[PDB]
Symmetry: D2
Subunit: 445 residues, 4 copies
Amino acid sequence: PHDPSFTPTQLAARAAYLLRGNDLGTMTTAAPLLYPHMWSWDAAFVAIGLAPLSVERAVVELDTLLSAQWRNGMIPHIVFANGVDGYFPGPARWATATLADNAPRNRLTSGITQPPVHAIAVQRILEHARTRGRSTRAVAEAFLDRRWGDLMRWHRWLAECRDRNERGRITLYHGWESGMDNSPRWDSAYANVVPGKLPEYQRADNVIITDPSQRPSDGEYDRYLWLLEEMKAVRYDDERLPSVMSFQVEDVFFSAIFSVACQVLAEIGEDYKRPHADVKDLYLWAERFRAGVVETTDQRTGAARDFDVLAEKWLVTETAAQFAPLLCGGLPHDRERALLKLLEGPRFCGHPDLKYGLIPSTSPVSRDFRPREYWRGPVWPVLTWLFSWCFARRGWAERARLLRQEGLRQASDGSFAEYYEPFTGEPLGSMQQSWTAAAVLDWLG
Amino acid sequence: PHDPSFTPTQLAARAAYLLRGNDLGTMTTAAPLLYPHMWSWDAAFVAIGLAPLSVERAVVELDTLLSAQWRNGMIPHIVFANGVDGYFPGPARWATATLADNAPRNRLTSGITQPPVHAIAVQRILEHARTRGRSTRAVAEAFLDRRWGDLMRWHRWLAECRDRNERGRITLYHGWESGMDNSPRWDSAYANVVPGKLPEYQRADNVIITDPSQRPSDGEYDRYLWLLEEMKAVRYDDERLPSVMSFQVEDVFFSAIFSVACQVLAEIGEDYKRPHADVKDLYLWAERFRAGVVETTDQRTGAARDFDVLAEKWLVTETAAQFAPLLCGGLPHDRERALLKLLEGPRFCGHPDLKYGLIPSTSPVSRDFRPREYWRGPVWPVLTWLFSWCFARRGWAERARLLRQEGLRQASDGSFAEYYEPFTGEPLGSMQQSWTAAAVLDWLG
Amino acid sequence: PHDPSFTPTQLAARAAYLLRGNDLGTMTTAAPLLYPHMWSWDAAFVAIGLAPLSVERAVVELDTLLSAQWRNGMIPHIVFANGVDGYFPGPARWATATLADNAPRNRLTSGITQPPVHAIAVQRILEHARTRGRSTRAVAEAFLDRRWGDLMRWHRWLAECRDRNERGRITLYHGWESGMDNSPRWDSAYANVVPGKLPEYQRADNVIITDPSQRPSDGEYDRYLWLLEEMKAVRYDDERLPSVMSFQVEDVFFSAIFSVACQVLAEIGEDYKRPHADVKDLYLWAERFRAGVVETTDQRTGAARDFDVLAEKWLVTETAAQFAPLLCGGLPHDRERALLKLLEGPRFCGHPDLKYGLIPSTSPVSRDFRPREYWRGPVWPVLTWLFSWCFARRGWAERARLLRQEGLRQASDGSFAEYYEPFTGEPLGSMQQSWTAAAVLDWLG
Amino acid sequence: PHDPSFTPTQLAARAAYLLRGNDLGTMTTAAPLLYPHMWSWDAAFVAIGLAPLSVERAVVELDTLLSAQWRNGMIPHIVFANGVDGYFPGPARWATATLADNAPRNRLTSGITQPPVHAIAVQRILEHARTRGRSTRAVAEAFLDRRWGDLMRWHRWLAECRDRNERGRITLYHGWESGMDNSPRWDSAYANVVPGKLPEYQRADNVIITDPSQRPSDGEYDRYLWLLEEMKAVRYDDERLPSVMSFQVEDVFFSAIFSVACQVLAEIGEDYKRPHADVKDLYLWAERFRAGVVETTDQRTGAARDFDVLAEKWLVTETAAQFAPLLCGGLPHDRERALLKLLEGPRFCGHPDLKYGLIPSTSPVSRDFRPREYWRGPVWPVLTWLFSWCFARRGWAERARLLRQEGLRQASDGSFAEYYEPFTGEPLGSMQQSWTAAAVLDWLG
């Protein structure tokens, strides 16, 4: 009636209820119907949301993801649930099971990767487990014994195979690998993608989300799906992608995440007496990718740019990815103040028409802005959580607190929406999105 | 470490996580392994715990229970999950599917009943739904349209077939129907139960709860199972039970619950324009069973007595059932003050060695008291919730608040135990008990 | 910013801060400037607000008020702070210090009374005290020893001298005695108050509240001050008032409060072994005023009417006072259901334009409704509190909870306003009103 | 009863109640009786406690303290309340009003200083103000205009006159200047303080705190009062003190606080466009005292040592002061990990007998440990607050949260004790200590 919002305990309960309801047994779908499988960075956030509920189950979630890790160390961005249809492109379209020599034998996966937030989830599990007593600590420590080597191979694959020239930035061969499918970041790179004979297909996502304004266009999907054909043609061989892919970009937000994840994992390695050589490698990558992020930055505002490897051009756009350097640190004092000022001012969090004091995925004042259209504008709870947690790690306690507070206010409708209209607060995308519930559980758990 | 307790939001989240994890699809088990099926009054409490999470799902829970209602209106106390073993006595032992003309054709059920808390659950669903907007109200109202007639037949079966002499008290033919299997209330009646040739059997409950001190003895189970043979021999025919059952008691706590449920359902019937004749019948039963409860009461303390129909003897014991008249009202002012004084004084809630200010199932100062032994002493969260809610309905706001507060303190370990040791607070019985989580969700939802 | 509301902990802190700030030492002013003295029922609510902060200091507040009790038992509605100006009519205008033979020697007081909510304060103090342990229980019990007789003398003067005919309704000689100075309730009785030669005066209330739309008019104050002259002329003699006063009305809301207070004080007397004859009188008065209230109600809707004793005429108006019978009980079942339907429906809490689900002081559909004008429309937090507490005492747990939740939502701005605009929620009247903070403290304390 | 703790809302309310109760008008006493005046760093913490209640009043508190600032910039550690006795040494014993040419004309003050936590208060005021809207931001910004110069003069006197050699550590001439009067830190410097003819005196502190185990000894007060005589003899002349004082120590904890304060005030200056030269000085001092602190640490464990300037000797003791470098930063990575391991291990927060996971003022395994004796062992809520806030500023979000959670658990008794027994949790020292309430208000405000 007069106020449709939930109290903190009611909201925490519905968040946990949601998360258990998306559990298939050993994996959690990223949403009920739109994403009926395990997505890689979603699964790290699900593990974070599970840690206040069951350390054992949170560990299971990462165990399931890491059991799908490729032989060369890549964590694919989708681990498909057996027998489940309703997401396209599904296992048959990817054909990694028949074409990818490195794909796991016991799991169906996609053929591309996604950002390495996984060490952050590991840290949250360890922190929860240390508050829960000896037996729970044992569970978390046993997971480190089992999986430390796999997490290293994951970070090592990114540093060695997606940063071949040691530039300190991660090359993507698909926009899906950024986690921001249709970001304006990738428009000029996608304009150079020219599909050949693209095998017929039928989208599934817009059968579930029928409002065309909330999802990418058919033309975008044509390009998404053609890049799959380019990878398939070389059997997903790492060595051949630089020669054949029509899409090759350095992703500065992915890179900043990687810098933070390496430092987090390095600290975990020290605390739990992992091999010194590993910790040394992790610190080395943390510093290399921090520097690689800073090298992209605008000299006036500190804003980070992506880089189009094929066009050899800095990609200048007005999305939340510009704030990559706030995540990993490294800007000189004066430029970081400039970047925080851009973040808080009227092009982003301080825009006068915003319902909440939150970061829109694209600036409302950019010509690229579309208030409903996926990564072209809407406010994403997963980004609110990531910025808030990284800001607290920088020591910006009040800044982190304000993002968390506004994020809880936006989530208090209980829709657990994928993303929200920046001006009206209308829930968009899939309802009951697992990583939105997990953001809420962490903020309250 | 220094404090093992959960915060209110953490506790609400783990409670909801638990409840969803016990959901088989359309029914919720009463516990993970000890009770791997739907129990009747457990299911009313599960519906209460689900109402803050999903009005639709709470309604489903009662729909599933009412679809197992017998043709004469009895709600059996177990609706068995198809294919599930591990509880004894299971469907084969009861044989209601082959012997009971009134048993439903599409469900496997037990052959006995359990207390009618169901209207209370309906009230909580309606109250939640009225705070959630038109579409949710529609869901709750549609359930009333579908099931009002079935709830009436349920109350009518109790009033007509378990109160044949219109004494205002409910006759039980099995201690399991009281929900307090091994209460000292039933010891002298069970002493008159003499098993004949009892078919061989093997207990399942104490394979799961192996500590013999927490469950009934083998001798008790021999008597529990023999009464099944007496019912089976007459094909569970209502008309023949008075002639053949070795166990026939009037249960004053069940009766007080029934008086309250009739009044609650009558009020619901008025609010939602149900047939006047039904509402009139409900008020008539509410008054008859209130009076029947008061007639049992001790002239000095107000304590309610059960009645052994076969022995024609008042059953005088010191259990929490003595406080039946506080639930339904009706004592003269002076005797209700006496009864509250007994409740709060040193034989019950004010006993000096109690960890919490809560009602033990048997008085610690009774010779019958056993601190670990099921209904012989332990503190039960389900009873804390029922007394607290009934006390608030009497207008005793502070008394209800204090019970709720102590109950949340006891539950804050997150074990969601079936019952608790009264002195040490050790969790006993099954962990992850659904109606304990539901008590917590209601108190916080 | 985006959300200027306070959290529960911030709101509780600021409420306590305010209350201590209005403390002159042994008395708390009702507001900092508009009401710079102790008012009688404000003092009862202040004591309720202090009980979670300090039982000792809550007890002092009632001790101070009763030290001003008149020799015949009347508690005057204002106890003036020594040396403080700024409220008119002040002590020189009342002249009780020289005219009133019953007024106390050691305090400057007014010459009229106010509603007897004091017993409710005493109950809240006792409930807090019993949760604080032995030393604090001693404080509250010693207060009962010191002041039980004065509280009896208070209730007895009401029953004997303001209900001379034993009608079970309290007679008032001034609208100020109802606490609802300019309620539409009193308009037709005030229209027959014809002031003669009224000594010159200058208002102070509208120097502090300058917006004329929020206070009574000059013409209304002329009548308020004239009744003062009629009282002074007979030296405030109880025996003379019914022959000279141009204003004589039976106040059904005051009467309902009195019935509740007697029942509450009777129960306290039974708990703490007070004289039997006092408890017996108290129960007798509770019943007599319960019936007197019921006698006034519309036999269809249950709405309570005031009565103009001089016109010998029932006063039919649409204010919150119509709901008096919900406070004290006693209506036939059908009549009370109809009155609840009036409360919850579109003439009161269900009005579609209300910002909160709260009771407006006057029905928005009434010809008399003024959304800003004191008791002619605004929502009063003190009434929300009283209705919610009385509702919980009737056993209407959800109705009480709903009012409390909306009241806290309304108070969450931290203005602690005297009253609020019903449609926009604008804080009106005085800011920093002591009984608004006390309502918040109790709902959260 | 069973649980005598307060809820968060009750605790926040009582904390605010206490703080307003210790307000004399423009200053708040540090305790009601033991410290019946304004102390300098207590006033900083009081301002922090007031910021959620009233930015205007928080600003008044710092205005009052700075109105007592000495002409050379020193903030004295006591500003005496006019006409109040009961603390010794009082203003007649200090005689700054006649001896001290730099002492203010309008205030009676002490003649020594205390740690510069004031900038942190200013930051908390500003953060609260920016969440309250335009009018409240104006108040806080107008305070910065009025008082920026006085805060600069404060930091500059510390840097120029208590660090004459530019060593990056603050020199003290009295143990009272450290805030840790009887810390084992100062025992070996005090052993070389040989009082000559000391004028007769009578302690007041141990009339109010009568238990001798909780306060310093007579022999210790003889030395505290003797240093007073040495100061008075040179009329508190900065230029003369290093030639006469029998007590001269570099205080590494005070020094760390100073480095943090300079960095915090530098950032404030950048945000509010203060003179560039001031911000530059402030950053220079932050760095210089950061390094001065690091210079003192054990190269293996990181523990910070004080320095006795007269003995020319590092002071090695096991108190909470060893953790100074965690506040300001600057340690090499390995050294800081070792110091954190010392903090969390069995010599401090990990000691197995501690009731709470909190930092004891002296290590329980130290020969010097006394569990009741002021700074020789007890747990101090003001230190918990300072460590938790500085930890959060380092980006150690979980470490800060853990301290805050345990601090609130400890404070939940509502005693607001000065300090607590580390093993049993007994409240010790003064009850109703203003900076203990302020820590609670901030952690919940």
